[PDB]
UniProtKB/Swiss-Prot annotation, chain D:
It comes from the Eukaryota. Residues 34-43 have a biased composition (Polar residues). Residues 34-62 are annotated as: Disordered. Disulfide bonds: none annotated. This is Uncharacterized 341.7 kDa protein in psbD-psbC intergenic region. It is found in: Plastid, Chloroplast. It comes from Chlamydomonas reinhardtii (Chlamydomonas smithii). Residues 44-53 have a biased composition (Basic residues).
Length: 43, 262, 59, 93, 68, 391, 125, 37, 50, 90
């Protein structure tokens, strides 16, 4: 998939809308999902 | 907003601020540029009911405060995350679900760019069409070998073509006005033209009166709700019939003169 | 002329519902006549309309 | 002085993610044609943060929310992209 | 072009020689009113009292008098 | 709506019913509105579809209006277009992209939250300080240390950016704050766009150079006005092209008859009209016989592309093919050589000479000439390296 | 025409409902003119469990036959597992799986390395 | 593949009108059933 | 192809002004109609009983 | 409704004979109306695949592309009089 500019705008709106245990078992992919999603909507 | 999908929307476009060949052409070019923008804002494809928005928004926003079944929930969650990945990444073997675009769908459609593109107002030609049509009619003519190829022939085929064209146009008009909603539309337009003609008449005859030798009940409810056979004088029917019969009175003699000529 | 000077949607719809009300379900005059009518003053608020209506429901 | 790129702009999302957000370990050998110490520390900090967000020990008692010490390392590159896009007007003739 | 325009002008001059109604008999198959020719009468649905006022105003405008 | 109560509506029994039933009155009103709109729909559909019966195309050009050039396929062709010049493609697209970045609200909510942050500098909801403490030394080498230092200078570099340029909404670089929001209405956003000169970038905005109204000066009516007029003509021509594409997508004749281009001439019979309306309906649009059969088109093209000689070239004395003149590790191993290519030779050579330009962190604007992109970046790096020896 | 809120949503909802109703009537008819044999356990296992990825192994062990998981606790654990898988696939999309970047993009996005046919046909088949 | 009549009939402005008319029709059908009191 | 679009328009508007707005079924519909109060309230203004 | 699970291998041949449902090429010689002039075999095939796989996007995307064709016109990369030539295109 390659988004057009309008679909990129839809992605930015969805990502900026959405949201509104021991360290061992924590997955190795434990990053900030919202920050990575928005840094993917850009670039 | 209320007159959006109608021909009476290109008359509000000329009532905006300045927005700035003739000045009317410049204003029309400015309105086309204003329609070109707000499509370049890339907000037209956004819909609040898109499956893409329901993937993020209505999935974190619904939980709120508030094989078998388990491996039917796991696969559903995996499919939802697969669609989210396809909408964001270079994920493979996932097909996206589209949405109906409802904002600024075709900005180039509700514009009249014809008078600007054909270089009018600054300062192509038809009629090869009918010449080619009658030329093909003559050149082929279907041959009336059943009347042993008569001499006239092309005259008969041209008469058939003209009769068929006239009858097709008239049949289309009659079939269009045979719809009761089309008759409602005609009645509404006739009422509007009567009131506007009264305004014209008021102004004009008042001027040519002082220039000599120099509420809904009355206002479109008892007309819109009544059968128009009632509120229409027989005078206008007789007038239209007299005009029609005066116009089409020389048709037999002109037909005889055309067909009996060379 | 005959096609354009024909009843529109409003006049056609007021011709079938009007028939249904004042022409088809106005046959209840024979019912209310065999049970009881006064007519004439059965207009206004005689209060026998309510009794006739509930008697028509009860049958 | 004119419009040009820079290596300091860090236009690559792979750079911006292997340096700031994604810290994993790959075990393979190359076939066709990075301060591990720091990476392990950042991964452990990431794990502690995820854990804390999972036991709802933050003021916002939600597992996933919107932080607002917004990342300068992301807002700066968004502004850089906008500036380089709007400064192309001086690239005429 | 002059021949085509002359044919149209000959048709128009024939209509001018027709002029008015004189010389033509009344026809029982073609009365002067289409409501006579067809069978078009107003009935119970559509006719209302105010329609007389509107009819008066339309007839005044059709006759050509500025009174109502 | 309270109406149908006077004497003026006395006589109709259904109106007499609707006197005492407001729900019937409202049903009548809504039904009459819906019936009128249905009549509008019927009439508009007829007015859309019935002109399609009256369209006839030229039989010589098949409705195109342009024919292949008699010579050369020149002084008989058209006069090319603005976009055929391949040397100016990247400059034209760069200026267009710079213009479109003004309108682009793809990063709209992000710039809105940045605007709110710089408006009210009293925010909250931090809840965890980022640790993010490793700019280790000005020493050592590699790529990790350089990228990590450039990533750790983000706060001071962002302060420099906000001091030199500020927010785009505070300098009108973007469209501004919430002016065009979807889901509001098509028409409120049109009003907001028509407000001031929001449909134009500040490079063409009239309310930026009116202060130079005395004596003209920097040609606010001769350069800025010319640029704005050219931009408006380009967007109007884009709308015309989109209308032509929309008409071509449904097999209809194109409404806008464009002038012939550098490979085409006007049609002999039309002159460029290519189609027109007429009183006589089209019997190809009717009865569906508008498009030719595929086998018939194949037979026509095969016979046209395969001429045959019915005379043996020994009785007629012909020894050569038809034409004039008559008597008479490359292109067979590798195959030809590109012709449109050649202006990018210097950039290709420089990209091969300096492999560091292939860095993923580097993003040049793009271009082929000495001015723009790779050569501009290399000249900037060389000027910096020369001037750091003197400082 | 349809329920009020928007016609832009109820029209795809009606198309989806028609497609899924046609699927549910195509099924339950091919379970009456062709009722299920042990295929109901063969094609619903194995080929479905293979599509189930990692990070669901913990919840599959816990909720199914190893413990209990209530209703909202089960949904919360399923959401957590789905988000772990989502983050893993985002990482696999940008920096790759457990392999280098020169295979994450260079041979994968650029479609070099043609699919294994000689080895997968001789050594395997 | 260019369904011009259906694209014209299901244009966004016409869809907005159909939504408004469905709202009015549903409200005036409810008002007429809930009046049974 | 020329006649179906008129039927489509007519049906599409019939769904909104007849199916939803104003229905009209046959048979026994006494208990659903308050209209009959007005209907018997104008009986002396209707045709002489016969 | 019924439970008579008849077994026959000619039903595959009958289902293959229901390719006339897909193409509607039998309609003129059977009824007089050439429905193949208006039927969309690709849309029928997409609907059949969507029904079989329980994936309604396969049919819905094609139907929406057919309806909203104008919005599928190229609006990215075609900005402001993007005509080259016939000769440059050649
Ligand atoms: Zn031509
Ligand atoms: Zn030439």
């Amino acid at each position: 998939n390659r988004n057009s500019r309008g679909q990129v705008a839809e992605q930015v709106r969805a990502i900026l809308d959405q949201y509104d245990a021991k360290t061992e078992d924590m997955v190795d992919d434990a990053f900030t999902t919202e920050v990575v999603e928005e840094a993917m909507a850009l670039f | 907003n209320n007159t959006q999908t109608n021909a009476f929307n290109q008359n509000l476009w000329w009532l905006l601020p300045n927005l700035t060949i003739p000045t009317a052409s410049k204003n029309q070019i400015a309105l086309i540029r204003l329609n070109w923008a707000l499509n370049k804002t890339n907000i037209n494809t956004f819909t609040d009911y898109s499956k893409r928005n329901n993937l993020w928004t209505t999935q974190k926003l619904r939980n709120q405060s508030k094989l078998n079944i388990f491996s039917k929930k796991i696969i559903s969650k995996v499919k939802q995350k697969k669609q989210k990945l396809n909408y964001m990444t270079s994920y493979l073997n996932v097909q996206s679900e589209h949405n109906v675009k409802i904002f600024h769908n075709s900005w180039w459609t509700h514009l009249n760019i014809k008078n600007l593109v054909n270089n009018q107002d600054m300062v192509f030609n038809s009629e090869f069409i009918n010449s080619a049509i009658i030329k093909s009619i003559n050149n082929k003519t279907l041959v009336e070998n059943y009347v042993y190829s008569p001499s006239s022939e092309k005259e008969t085929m041209q008469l058939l073509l003209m009769s068929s064209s006239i009858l097709l146009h008239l049949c289309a008009i009659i079939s269009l006005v045979s719809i009761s909603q089309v008759r409602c539309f005609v009645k509404f337009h006739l009422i509007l033209l009567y009131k506007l003609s009264n305004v014209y008449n008021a102004i004009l005859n008042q001027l040519s009166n002082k220039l000599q030798k120099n509420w809904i009940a009355y206002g479109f409810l008892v007309e819109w709700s009544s059968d128009f056979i009632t509120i229409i004088p027989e005078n206008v029917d007789i007038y239209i019939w007299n005009v029609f019969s005066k116009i089409y009175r020389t048709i037999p003699l002109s037909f005889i003169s055309t067909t009996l000529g060379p | 002329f005959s096609t354009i000077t024909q009843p529109d949607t409003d006049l056609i719809a007021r011709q079938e519902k009007g028939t249904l009300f004042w022409d088809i379900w106005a046959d209840f005059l024979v019912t209310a006549a065999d049970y009881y009518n006064v007519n004439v003053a059965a207009l206004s608020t005689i209060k026998a309309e309510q009794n006739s209506l509930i008697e028509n429901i009860s049958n | 002085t004119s419009l040009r790129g820079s290596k300091q702009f860090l236009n690559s999302l792979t750079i911006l993610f292997k340096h700031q957000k994604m810290f994993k370990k790959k075990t393979l050998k190359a076939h066709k044609w990075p301060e591990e110490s720091s990476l392990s520390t950042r991964l452990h900090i990431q794990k502690k943060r995820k854990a804390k967000k999972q036991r709802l020990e933050t003021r916002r008692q939600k597992k996933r929310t919107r932080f607002f010490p917004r990342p300068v390392w992301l807002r700066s590159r968004m502004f850089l992209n906008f500036l380089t896009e709007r400064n192309k007007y001086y690239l005429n003739s | 072009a002059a021949v085509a325009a002359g044919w149209h002008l000959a048709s128009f001059a024939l209509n001018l020689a027709f002029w008015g109604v004189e010389g033509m008999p009344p026809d029982r198959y073609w009365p002067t009113s289409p409501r006579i020719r067809l069978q078009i009468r107003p009935g119970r649905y559509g006719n209302m009292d105010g329609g007389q006022r509107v009819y008066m105003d339309y007839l005044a405008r059709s006759e050509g008098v500025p009174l109502n | 709506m309270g109406q149908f109560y006077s004497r003026e509506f006395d006589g109709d029994p259904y109106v007499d019913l609707m006197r005492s039933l407001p729900e019937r009155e409202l049903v009548w009103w809504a039904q009459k509105v819906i019936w009128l709109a249905e009549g509008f729909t019927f009439v508009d559909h007829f007015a859309r579809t019935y002109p399609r019966l009256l369209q006839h195309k030229c039989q010589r050009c098949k409705g195109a209006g342009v024919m292949t050039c008699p010579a050369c396929l020149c002084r008989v062709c058209g006069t090319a277009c603005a976009w055929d010049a391949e040397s100016e493609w990247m400059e034209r697209w760069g200026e267009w992209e710079s213009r479109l970045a003004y309108y682009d609200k793809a990063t709209g909510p992000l710039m809105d939250e940045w605007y709110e942050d710089v408006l009210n500098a009293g925010n909250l909801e931090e809840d965890t300080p980022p640790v993010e403490d490793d700019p280790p030394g000005p020493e050592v080498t590699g790529r990790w240390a350089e990228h990590d230092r450039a990533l750790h200078k983000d706060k001071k570099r962002m302060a420099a950016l906000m001091r030199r340029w500020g927010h785009p909404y505070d300098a009108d670089a973007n469209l501004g704050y919430q002016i065009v929001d979807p889901t509001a209405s098509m028409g409120e956003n049109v009003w907001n766009m028509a407000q001031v000169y929001n449909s134009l970038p500040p490079e063409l905005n009239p309310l930026r150079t009116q202060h130079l109204a005395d004596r003209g000066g920097g040609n606010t009516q001769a350069a800025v006005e010319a640029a704005r007029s050219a931009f408006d003509a380009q967007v109007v021509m884009e709308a015309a092209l989109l209308q032509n594409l929309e008409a071509a997508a449904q097999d209809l004749p194109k409404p806008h008859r464009l002038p012939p281009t550098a490979g085409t001439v006007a049609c002999n019979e039309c002159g460029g009209a290519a189609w027109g309306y007429s009183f006589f309906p089209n019997t190809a649009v009717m009865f569906g016989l508008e498009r030719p059969f595929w086998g018939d088109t194949l037979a026509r093209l095969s016979k046209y592309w395969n001429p045959t000689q019915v005379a043996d070239p020994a009785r007629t004395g012909q020894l050569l093919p038809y034409g004039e003149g008559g008597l008479r590790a490359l292109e067979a191993v590798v195959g030809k050589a590109p012709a449109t290519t050649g202006r990018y030779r210097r950039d290709l050579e420089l990209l091969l000479a300096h492999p560091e330009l292939r860095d993923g962190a580097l993003r040049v604007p793009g271009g082929w000439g000495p001015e723009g992109g790779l050569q501009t970046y290399l000249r900037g790096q060389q000027e910096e390296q020369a001037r750091m020896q003197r400082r | 025409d349809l329920p009020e809120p928007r016609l832009a949503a109820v029209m795809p909802d009606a198309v989806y409902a028609l497609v899924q109703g046609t699927h549910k009537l195509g099924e339950y008819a091919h379970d009456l003119v062709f009722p299920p044999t042990p295929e109901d356990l063969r094609k619903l296992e194995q080929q479905v469990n293979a599509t189930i990825p990692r990070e669901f192994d913990r919840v599959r062990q816990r909720y199914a036959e190893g413990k209990i998981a209530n209703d909202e606790q089960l949904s919360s654990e399923l959401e957590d597992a789905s988000f772990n898988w989502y983050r893993r696939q985002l990482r696999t999309s940008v920096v790759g799986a457990t392999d280098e970047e020169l295979e994450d993009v260079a041979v994968r996005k650029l479609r070099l390395e043609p699919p294994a046919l000689q080895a997968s046909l001789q050594e395997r088949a | 593949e260019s369904w011009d009549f259906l694209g014209w009939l299901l244009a966004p402005g016409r869809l907005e009108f159909y939504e408004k008319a469905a709202c009015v029709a549903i409200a005036l059908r409810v008002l007429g059933i809930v009046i049974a009191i | 192809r020329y006649t179906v679009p008129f039927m489509v328009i007519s049906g599409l508007f019939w769904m909104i002004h007849t199916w939803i707005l104003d229905p009209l079924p046959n048979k026994f519909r006494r208990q659903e109609f308050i209209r009959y109060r007005r209907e018997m309230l104008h009986v002396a203004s209707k045709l002489n009983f016969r | 409704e019924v439970l008579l699970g008849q077994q026959e291998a000619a039903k595959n041949v009958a289902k293959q004979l229901d390719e006339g449902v897909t193409y509607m090429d039998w309609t003129y010689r059977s009824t007089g109306v050439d429905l193949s002039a208006v039927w969309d075999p690709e849309l029928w095939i997409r609907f059949r695949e969507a029904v079989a796989q329980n994936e309604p996007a396969i049919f819905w995307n094609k139907l929406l592309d057919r309806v909203q064709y104008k919005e599928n016109l190229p609006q990215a990369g075609l900005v402001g009089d993007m005509r080259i030539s016939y000769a440059k295109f050649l």
